[PDB]
Coordinates of C-alpha atoms in Angstrom, one line a residue:
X1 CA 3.1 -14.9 -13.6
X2 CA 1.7 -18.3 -13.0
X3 CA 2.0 -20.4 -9.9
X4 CA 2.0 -24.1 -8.8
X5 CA -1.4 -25.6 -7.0
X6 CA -1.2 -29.2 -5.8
X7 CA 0.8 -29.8 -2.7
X8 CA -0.3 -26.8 -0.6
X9 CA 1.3 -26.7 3.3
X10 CA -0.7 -27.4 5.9
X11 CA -2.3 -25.0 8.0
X12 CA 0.6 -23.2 9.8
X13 CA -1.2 -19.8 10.7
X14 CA -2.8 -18.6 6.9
X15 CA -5.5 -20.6 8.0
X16 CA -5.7 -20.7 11.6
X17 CA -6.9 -16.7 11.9
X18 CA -6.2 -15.3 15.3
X19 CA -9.5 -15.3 17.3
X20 CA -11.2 -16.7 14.2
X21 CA -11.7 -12.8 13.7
X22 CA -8.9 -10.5 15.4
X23 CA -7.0 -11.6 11.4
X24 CA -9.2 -8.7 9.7
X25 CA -7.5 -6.3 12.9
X26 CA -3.9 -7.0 12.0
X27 CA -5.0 -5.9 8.3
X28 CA -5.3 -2.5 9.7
X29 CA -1.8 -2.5 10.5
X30 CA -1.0 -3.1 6.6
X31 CA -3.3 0.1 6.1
X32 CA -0.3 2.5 7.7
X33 CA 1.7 1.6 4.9
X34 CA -0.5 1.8 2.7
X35 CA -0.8 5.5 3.3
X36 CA 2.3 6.1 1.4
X37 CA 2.2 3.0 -1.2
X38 CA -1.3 3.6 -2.3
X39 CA -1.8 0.0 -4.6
X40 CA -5.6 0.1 -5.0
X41 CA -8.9 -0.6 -3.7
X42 CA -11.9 1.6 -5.2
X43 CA -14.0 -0.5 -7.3
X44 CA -17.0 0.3 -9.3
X45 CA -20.1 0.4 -7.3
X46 CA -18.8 -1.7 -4.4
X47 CA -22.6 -2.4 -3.8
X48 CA -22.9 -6.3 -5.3
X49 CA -25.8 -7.5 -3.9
X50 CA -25.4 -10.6 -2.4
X51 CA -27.8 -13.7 -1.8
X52 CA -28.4 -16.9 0.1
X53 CA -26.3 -19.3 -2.2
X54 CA -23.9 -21.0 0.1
X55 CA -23.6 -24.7 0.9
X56 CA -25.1 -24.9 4.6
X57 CA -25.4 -29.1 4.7
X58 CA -22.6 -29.9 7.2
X59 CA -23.9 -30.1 10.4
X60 CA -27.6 -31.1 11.1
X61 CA -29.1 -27.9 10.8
X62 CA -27.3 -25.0 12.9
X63 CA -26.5 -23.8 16.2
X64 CA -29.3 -21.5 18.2
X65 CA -26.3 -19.2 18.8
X66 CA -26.8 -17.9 15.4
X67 CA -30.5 -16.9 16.1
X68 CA -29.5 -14.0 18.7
X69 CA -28.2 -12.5 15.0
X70 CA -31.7 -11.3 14.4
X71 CA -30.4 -11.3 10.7
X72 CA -27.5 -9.4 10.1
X73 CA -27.9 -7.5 6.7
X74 CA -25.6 -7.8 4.4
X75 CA -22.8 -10.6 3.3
X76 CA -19.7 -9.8 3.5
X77 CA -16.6 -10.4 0.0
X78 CA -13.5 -9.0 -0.5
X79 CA -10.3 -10.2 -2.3
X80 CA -6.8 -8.4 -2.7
X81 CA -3.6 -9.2 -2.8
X82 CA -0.6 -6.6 -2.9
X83 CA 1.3 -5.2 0.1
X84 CA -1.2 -2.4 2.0
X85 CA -4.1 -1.8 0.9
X86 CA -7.2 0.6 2.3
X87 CA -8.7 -1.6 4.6
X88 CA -8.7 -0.6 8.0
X89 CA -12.2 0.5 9.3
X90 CA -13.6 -1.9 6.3
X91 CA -11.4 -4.7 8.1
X92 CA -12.8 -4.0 11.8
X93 CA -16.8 -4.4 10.1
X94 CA -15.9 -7.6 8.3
X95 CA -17.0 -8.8 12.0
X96 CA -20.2 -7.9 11.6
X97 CA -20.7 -8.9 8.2
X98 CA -19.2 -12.0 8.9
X99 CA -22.0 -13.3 11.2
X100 CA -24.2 -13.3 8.2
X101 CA -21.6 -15.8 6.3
X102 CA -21.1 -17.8 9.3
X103 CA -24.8 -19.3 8.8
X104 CA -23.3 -21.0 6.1
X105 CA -21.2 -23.1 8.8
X106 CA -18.4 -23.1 6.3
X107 CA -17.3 -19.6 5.8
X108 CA -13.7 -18.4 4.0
X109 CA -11.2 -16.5 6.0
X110 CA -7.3 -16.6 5.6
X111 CA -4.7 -13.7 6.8
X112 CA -1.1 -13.7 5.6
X113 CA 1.5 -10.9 6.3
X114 CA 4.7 -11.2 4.9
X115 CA 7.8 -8.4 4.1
X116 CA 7.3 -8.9 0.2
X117 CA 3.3 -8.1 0.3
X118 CA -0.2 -8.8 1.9
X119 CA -3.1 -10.7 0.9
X120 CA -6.0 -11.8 2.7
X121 CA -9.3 -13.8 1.2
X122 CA -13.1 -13.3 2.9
X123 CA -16.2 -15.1 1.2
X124 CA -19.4 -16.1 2.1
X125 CA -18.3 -19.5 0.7
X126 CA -16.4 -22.1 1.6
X127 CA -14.9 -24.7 -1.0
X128 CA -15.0 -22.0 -3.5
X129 CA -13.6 -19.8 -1.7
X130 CA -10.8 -22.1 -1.2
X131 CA -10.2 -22.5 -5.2
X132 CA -10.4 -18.6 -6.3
X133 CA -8.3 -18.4 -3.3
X134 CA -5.1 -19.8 -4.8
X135 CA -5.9 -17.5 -8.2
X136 CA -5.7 -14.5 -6.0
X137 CA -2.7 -14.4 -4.4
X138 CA -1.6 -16.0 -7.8
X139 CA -1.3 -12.2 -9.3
X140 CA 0.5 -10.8 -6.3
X141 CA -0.7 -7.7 -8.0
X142 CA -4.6 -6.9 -7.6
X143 CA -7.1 -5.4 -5.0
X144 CA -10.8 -5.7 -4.8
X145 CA -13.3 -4.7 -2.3
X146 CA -16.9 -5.4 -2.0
X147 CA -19.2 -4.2 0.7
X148 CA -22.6 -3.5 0.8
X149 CA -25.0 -1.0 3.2
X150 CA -28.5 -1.9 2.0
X151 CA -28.9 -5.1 0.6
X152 CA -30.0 -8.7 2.7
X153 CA -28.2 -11.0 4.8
X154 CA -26.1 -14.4 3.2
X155 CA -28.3 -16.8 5.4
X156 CA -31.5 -16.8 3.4
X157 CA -33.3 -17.5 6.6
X158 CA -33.6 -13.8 8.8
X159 CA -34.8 -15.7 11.8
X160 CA -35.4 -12.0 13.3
X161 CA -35.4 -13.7 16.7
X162 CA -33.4 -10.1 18.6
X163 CA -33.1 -12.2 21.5
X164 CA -29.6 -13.0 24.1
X165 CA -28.4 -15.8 25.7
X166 CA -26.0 -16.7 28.2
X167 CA -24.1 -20.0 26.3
X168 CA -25.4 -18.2 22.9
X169 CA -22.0 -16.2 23.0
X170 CA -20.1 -19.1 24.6
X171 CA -20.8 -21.2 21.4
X172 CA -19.6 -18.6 19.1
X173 CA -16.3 -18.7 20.6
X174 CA -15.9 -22.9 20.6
X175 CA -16.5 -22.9 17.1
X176 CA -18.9 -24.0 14.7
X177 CA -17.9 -26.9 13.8
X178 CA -16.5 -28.1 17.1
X179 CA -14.5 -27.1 19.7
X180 CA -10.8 -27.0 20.4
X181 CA -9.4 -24.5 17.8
X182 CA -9.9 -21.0 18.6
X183 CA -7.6 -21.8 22.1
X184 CA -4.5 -22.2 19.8
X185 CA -5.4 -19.2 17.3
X186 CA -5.5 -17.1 20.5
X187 CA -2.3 -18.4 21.8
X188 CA -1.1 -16.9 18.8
X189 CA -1.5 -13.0 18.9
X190 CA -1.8 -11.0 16.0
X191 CA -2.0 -7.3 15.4
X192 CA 1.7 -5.8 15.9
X193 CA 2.3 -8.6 17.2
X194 CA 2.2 -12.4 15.3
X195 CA 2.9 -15.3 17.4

């Protein structure tokens, strides 16, 4: 089964993610009927150690926001594609892995639910991310996971600053890139819910 790649859509909610993070929550949701479905997920030795290889040159430098991260501990990749999926709790951490990738100021994160299956696509990259995306879904018939419990962080940098702030947290939620954008995503509503 091979699929076209050219003239994607725009941006209509696969890549918006709800809270630029409650996506991986609606995932759970898929779990439930997974229960009975049962595609896959197990892979051998989901530890792939992971290392500081992302991009990181868009903005001069980074925020100070990511400094109360006091380095997270291990990056976060997974890729599947097939309605349900076992997910849930592994969904729900992808938060806290995902401060790790979001040094990287260019992360990967699209959700998609639809009646015929679900897919969803988390790297610690960005542009590539983008690329293997379209592959994935592509099979419409594949699930990997691949999460980590003792390995180090995507940044390359482990500032190790443990220190909070008071904007720190109000930075995070603007964006990092810019502002104006996770407003709209939570306008949305996801999570037995969808717009």
């Amino acid at each position: 089964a091979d699929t076209p790649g050219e003239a994607t859509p725009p941006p209509r909610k696969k890549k918006d993610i709800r809270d630029y993070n409650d996506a991986d929550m609606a995932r759970l949701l898929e779990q439930w009927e997974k229960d009975d479905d049962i595609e896959e997920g197990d892979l051998p030795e989901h530890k792939r150690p992971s290392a500081p290889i992302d991009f990181s040159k868009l903005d001069p430098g980074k925020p100070e926001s990511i400094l109360k991260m006091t380095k997270k501990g291990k990056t976060l990749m997974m890729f599947v594609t097939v309605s349900g999926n076992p997910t849930e709790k592994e969904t729900e951490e992808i938060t806290s892995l995902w401060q790790g990738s979001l040094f990287n100021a260019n992360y990967d994160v699209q959700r998609f639910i639809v009646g015929s299956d679900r897919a969803i696509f988390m790297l610690r990259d960005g542009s590539y991310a983008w690329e293997i995306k379209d592959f994935l879904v592509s099979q419409d018939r594949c699930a990997e996971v691949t999460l980590e419990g003792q390995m180090y962080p995507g940044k390359g940098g482990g500032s190790k600053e443990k220190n909070k702030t008071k904007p720190e947290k109000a930075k995070k939620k603007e964006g990092d890139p810019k502002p104006r954008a996770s407003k709209e995503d939570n306008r949305a509503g996801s999570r037995r819910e969808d717009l």
